[PDB]
Amino acid sequence: DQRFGDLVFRQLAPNVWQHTSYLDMPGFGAVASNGLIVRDGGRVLVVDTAWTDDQTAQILNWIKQEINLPVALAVVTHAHQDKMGGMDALHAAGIATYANALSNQLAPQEGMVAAQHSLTFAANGWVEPATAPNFGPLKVFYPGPGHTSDNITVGIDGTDIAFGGCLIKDSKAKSLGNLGDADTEHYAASARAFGAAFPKASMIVMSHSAPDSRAAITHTARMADKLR
Ligand SMILES: C[C@H](CS)C(=O)N1CCC[C@H]1C(=O)O
Ligand SMILES: [Zn+2]
Ligand SMILES: [Zn+2]
């Protein structure tokens, strides 16, 4: 782990790093959230902001120091603060931003700034490619409603990594966390659909646990079975 200001960065693969940021949530403690940073040749791609604009600017500072290539785009994985709280920092930096159309719709009411571009998805869950131009190795999949109605997931081609965002918890998690915005009927199926979309991914990265094996997916889905 590299501590960089109040954030933590961890290399996961030759071209992939996890960013971690923290927010004091009165009544919960200081909650970690993870996203990703991917180098694709001469550019960098970001998955999720940090909780705040200031923290997100720090991600960009770390990128400048440790990679020193332009950030071509960011994709954010639903309209909650841990994933979209730093949108303004990305925009101030001139970075093109992408989210599920539904996330952009929900952003204002959730207290978020919308991304500049909207992703749309085929019936089978795969992103419509024209809406995700120049995404390089990022393979974006809508697994169905679960943690939220708008949650999306991202595989990284050329690696063993798939990112479940807040949909997936690790194999030892005691619960699925706050289900206030969740689709309890469909959660289990959505978790399993994520697994089926990225069947060869052996490292599952997620927002609120450290990277784990595919047991994160099976355990998450099994816990979600109980919501029905
Ligand atoms: C505010 C975030 C948005 S995904 C959240 O709901 N969290 C963060 C950690 C788990 C869960 C919770 O509070 O129950
Ligand atoms: Zn969330
Ligand atoms: Zn979250």
Curated annotation (Swiss-Prot):
Domain of life the protein comes from: Bacteria
Swiss-Prot/TrEMBL cofactor(s): Zn(2+)
Location, primary (coarse class): periplasm
Record text on cofactor binding: Binds 2 Zn(2+) ions per subunit.
Keyword Transmembrane helix among record annotations: no
Any Gene Ontology CC annotation: periplasmic space
Record EC number: 3.5.2.6
Enzyme class, broadest EC rank: hydrolase
Known catalytic reactions: a beta-lactam + H2O = a substituted beta-amino acid
Notes on how activity is controlled: Inhibits by captopril, thiorphan, dimercaprol and tiopronin. This enzyme is not susceptible to inactivation by the beta-lactamase-blocking agents clavulanic acid.
Extra facts: Enterobacteriaceae carrying this gene (identified by PCR) have been isolated in Sweden, India, Pakistan, Bangladesh, England, Scotland, Northern Ireland, Australia and the USA. The organisms they were identified in were K.pneumoniae, Enterobacter cloacae, E.coli, Proteus spp, Citrobacter freundii, Morganella morganii, Providencia spp and Klebsille oxytoca. In India most isolates were from community-acquired infections rather than hospital-acquired infections, indicating the gene is widespread in the environment.
Subunit structure: Monomer.
Protein's job: Confers resistance to the different beta-lactams antibiotics (penicillin, cephalosporin and carbapenem) via the hydrolysis of the beta-lactam ring. Does not confer resistance to the polymixin colistin or the fluoroquinolone ciprofloxacin.
Name of the protein described by the UniProt record: Metallo-beta-lactamase type 2
Organism listed in the record: Klebsiella pneumoniae
